[PDB]
């Protein structure tokens, strides 16, 4: 058996919460966007000698669930607050929406700030798409700054598609607890 660890995942509609978990636990990725209502995944992981039943709770980013979402929060060992490195709108909500909601229900429980979609921050298609609307993809130093600002215990960037940065997200989610 292994040590139970409840990891809860929050952030804007479409940032890649779900994809990030599917990609970690099954190495699978979909182009398709099927919005989460609520889901639950598991992963027996081996980190630094010790073994762990990582529980992972995938929450709906959509505001409709603002009322129902914090039912997930009691007894959480660590949170992942997720933002797309490619939607600065999803970025500001980290201190606007996601850090207040979490600390409101769980004021002590560690946070790991997660910049998702790392594979698109260098994409011409996507840099150009934003250029139009006065926009900048979120850089590492800016992400790091946001993390410091919310007392995130780590800042970590990833892509569920390439899987660049992927395993370190969960390795560190487990590390915020042990």
Ligand X SMILES: Nc1nc2c(ncn2[C@@H]2O[C@H](COP(=O)(O)OP(=O)(O)NP(=O)(O)O)[C@@H](O)[C@H]2O)c(=O)[nH]1
Binding site for GTP, by residue number, is 13-19, 32-33, 35-36, 60-61, 117, 119-120, 159-161
Task: Determine, following the binding rule CB under 6 A, whether residue 116 of this chain makes contact with ligand X.
Answer: yes
Give Cβ neighbours of residue 122 (< 8 Å, ≥ 6 apart): none
What's the CA gap between 93 and 139, in Å, rounded?
16
How many residues touch ligand X under the rule CB under 6 A: the total is 22
Task: Return the one option of ligand X, Mg ion, none that residue 62 interacts with (CB less than 5 to 8 A, by type).
Answer: ligand X
Which residue in the set 120, 156, 173, 176 belongs to the binding site for ligand X (CB under 6 A)?
120
Task: Determine, following the binding rule CB under 5 A, whether residue 17 of this chain makes contact with Mg ion.
Answer: yes
Task: Return the one option of Mg ion, ligand X, none that residue 16 interacts with (CB less than 5 to 8 A, by type).
Answer: ligand X
Concatenating the DSSP letter of every residue in 66-131 gives TTTGGGG-TT-SEEEEEEETT-HHHHHHIIIIIHHHHHHH-SSS-EEEEEE-TTTTT-HHHHHHHH
Task: Determine, following the binding rule CB under 5 A, whether residue 142 of this chain makes contact with Mg ion.
Answer: no
Per-residue interface string for the shown chain with ligand X, residues 46-65, x marking contact by CB under 6 A: --------------xxx---
The angle formed by the CA atoms of residues 112, 114 and 117, to the nearest 5 degrees, is 170
């Amino acid at each position: 058996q292994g040590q139970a660890i409840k990891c809860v995942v929050v952030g804007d509609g479409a940032v890649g919460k779900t994809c990030l978990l599917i990609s970690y636990t099954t190495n699978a990725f979909s182009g398709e966007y099927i919005p989460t209502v609520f889901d639950n995944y598991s992963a027996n992981v081996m980190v630094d000698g010790k073994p762990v039943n990582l529980g992972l709770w995938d929450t709906a980013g959509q505001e409709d669930y603002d009322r129902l979402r914090p039912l997930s929060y009691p007894q959480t060992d660590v949170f992942l607050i997720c933002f797309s490195l490619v939607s600065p709108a999803s970025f500001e909500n980290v201190r606007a929406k996601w850090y207040p909601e979490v600390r409101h229900h769980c004021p002590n429980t560690p946070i790991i700030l997660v910049g998702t979609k790392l594979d698109l921050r260098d994409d011409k298609d996507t840099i150009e798409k934003l250029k139009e609307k006065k926009l900048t993809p979120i850089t590492y130093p800016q992400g790091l700054a946001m993390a410091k600002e919310i007392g995130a215990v780590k800042y970590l960037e990833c892509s569920a598609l390439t899987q660049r940065g992927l395993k370190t997200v969960f390795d560190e989610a487990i590390r915020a607890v042990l």
